[PDB]
Amino acid sequence: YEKIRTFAVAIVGVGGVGSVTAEMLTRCGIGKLLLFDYDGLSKVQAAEHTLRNINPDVLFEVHNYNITTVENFQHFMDRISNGGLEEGKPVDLVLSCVDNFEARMTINTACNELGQTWMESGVSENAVSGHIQLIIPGESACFACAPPLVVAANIDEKSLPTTMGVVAGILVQNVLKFLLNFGTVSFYLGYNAMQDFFPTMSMKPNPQCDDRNCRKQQEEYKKKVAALHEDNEWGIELV
Amino acid sequence: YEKIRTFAVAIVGVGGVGSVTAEMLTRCGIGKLLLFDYDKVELFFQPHQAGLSKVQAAEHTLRNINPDVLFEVHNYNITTVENFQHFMDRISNGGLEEGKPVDLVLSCVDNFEARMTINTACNELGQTWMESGVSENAVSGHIQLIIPGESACFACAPPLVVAANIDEKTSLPTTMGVVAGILVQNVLKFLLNFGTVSFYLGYNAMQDFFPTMSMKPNPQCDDRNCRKQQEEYKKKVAALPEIIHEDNEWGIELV
Amino acid sequence: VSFKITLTSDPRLPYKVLSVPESTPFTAVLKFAAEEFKVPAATSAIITNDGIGINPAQTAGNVFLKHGSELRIIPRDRVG
Amino acid sequence: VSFKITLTSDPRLPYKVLSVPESTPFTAVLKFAAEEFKVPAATSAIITNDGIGINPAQTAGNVFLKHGSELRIIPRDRVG
Ligand SMILES: Nc1ncnc2c1ncn2[C@@H]1O[C@H](COP(=O)(O)O)[C@@H](O)[C@H]1O
Ligand SMILES: [Zn+2]
Ligand SMILES: [Zn+2]
């Protein structure tokens, strides 16, 4: 549907999953993409150049910096809040396609503060596993609600093309269903490539999440909830 | 595993699904691709390539993505009498080593006639192939593994229009990307023998439902070579022949 | 003869039970079942509970005799 | 003191039953369970049967008191 041109999506990380994700949304005629990544051109600029030719009608804004530094982080939040299709309005979705937990925690911290819905994606090191997850701050679990062991233990973080293509495809399908409101949106969709198992789940916020802005968005969510046969010549009988 | 370089795959149809399928296998380092398509590029492909045949534009792009992959392409309609016989010749002898068959045929065509043509060819040859499809409305798709004689061929369970011999009278990028990724994953598992190969894997995009099943041959299939491969399969079957815990000072008991 | 036909492409696995004269061509039964499911009849195919493919171009009587009552519709998606 | 931990990423949904002293940090329980499942401990996370996320950096006693026995490991895939 042509209402797709009305939306803007930010993509963090234009590697394997993120670049396929960006191409798919460009071919769908998304109104605007924002691309964030950190390094000839930079990755975000090379991506922008190819995507512009695929669909000249899509608007692009790109940024080559590390969002996990203090000065760039505030800029990151500024563009989530005001870099929507109309300048001054937020983007309709953030997509996380980064390849470490620190950057996911940074996006999570930003979106919890802003009340910004995003989707997170991942692929396992050995390429036989991946997933997507929908994070509506306050309504579904944020990334800090269920931290991976290495994050919770404060330890330092010290076949690929097929799995990346599957994960990007299901990510963008979930984007389309969320934005255009058809079908059923998955709050979690896993991919086990070894056994072709695609578990769905719905992950819930922890009331004592470490991220205090997750907690505050949980309070606001609860407040908002509280506020409301052309023929048949044969004689076939359904029974 | 670099055993992937020892195999050759034929792809029929280099459209939405087929072109992504071809790119993925190129990036994986497949030994050889054979590409079959009758249509031109019209406006995976690129603007300046409009007007070339699809197989040649694909070959031009894929060669430079991976110079180690071998390519053979054919720009013709496989359902015509002269081209059909050439098609079978190249399935049988266009493998990585000339004179050997391809290890797999992939059907990425967009009509039932062409799938029936591939089906007829592979049953005669005893050639394993996988078929893929995407629904008109783009919210559904599937892949299917056809080992002639062992699993159902495309004629074992024909769609209604084919069985009634009626003439084929009657969001896309996302669904195609899923189907191709799912197709090539099954190719890798089949060729490199890791994981579980799906004989059928469906995709329901509306509800994120991915049914698997295993479809079996019809003993009275219309395709006579399906029936004969069923007999051969039965004769062939009759003829065959850890847990370390880096520390545990806490007293956690498995129970 | 009676058939229980399940739609494999729906997570709910919904089914329809159809009662039909023996001489009815099963192509008409498949069409009727697809219409009840509101999936396209033209691209629908039919298998047994064991997964054996069926060519619907035979009588409902013969489908029952050969395969029994419990059948499953699978899509045959046509685009590449 | 005791937990049943289910691996959500395996279609068989296998589980392990662990008995553990109240004072053990649950991070060690999660690691032990992942090792029994032969999945990577570092990227594993844990939720309740209801799907509520859990921060493992607390005592097993406190996890049990707050959430009970029935827990589920989910992968946290790290690449893009
Ligand atoms: N008989 C045939 N021989 C060769 N290519 C075909 C035949 N029928 C369909 N195709 C191709 O299959 C591809 C499917 O396109 P799509 O529907 O975009 O996946 C198109 O590029 C068609 O040209
Ligand atoms: Zn949280
Ligand atoms: Zn057959």
Please provide a written account of the structure.
The complex is a heterotetramer, with 2 copies of chain A and 2 copies of chain C (80 residues). Chain A has 239 residues and is of the alpha/beta class. Chain A has one domain: NAD(P)-binding Rossmann-like Domain (Rossmann fold, 3-Layer(aba) Sandwich). Chain A contains 7 helices and 9 strands, in the order E-H-E-H-E-H-E-H-E-E-H-H-E-E-H-E. Chain A has helices at 16-28, 43-54, 70-82, 101-114, 149-152, 160-180, 212-226; strands at residues 8-12, 32-37, 59-64, 93-96, 118-123, 129-135, 188-192, 200-201, 237-238. In chain A, strands 3-2-1-4-5-6-7-8 form an 8-stranded mixed β-sheet, sandwiched between helices. Chains in contact: A-B, A-C, A-D, B-C, B-D. Chain B binds chain C through residues 13, 15-18, 108-112, 132-136, 140-142, 152-153, 155-161, 163-164, 166, 170, 176, 200, 202, 204, 207, 209, 211, 213-218, 220-222, and chain C through 8-11, 27, 30-31, 34, 40-47, 50-57, 74-80. Strand 8 of chain B pairs antiparallel with strand 2 (15-19) of chain D. The structure holds adenosine monophosphate (AMP) and zinc ion (2 copies). Chain A: ATP binds at residues 16, 37, 43, 66, 100. Chain A: GO terms for molecular function: ATP binding; protein homodimerization activity; UFM1 activating enzyme activity; zinc ion binding.
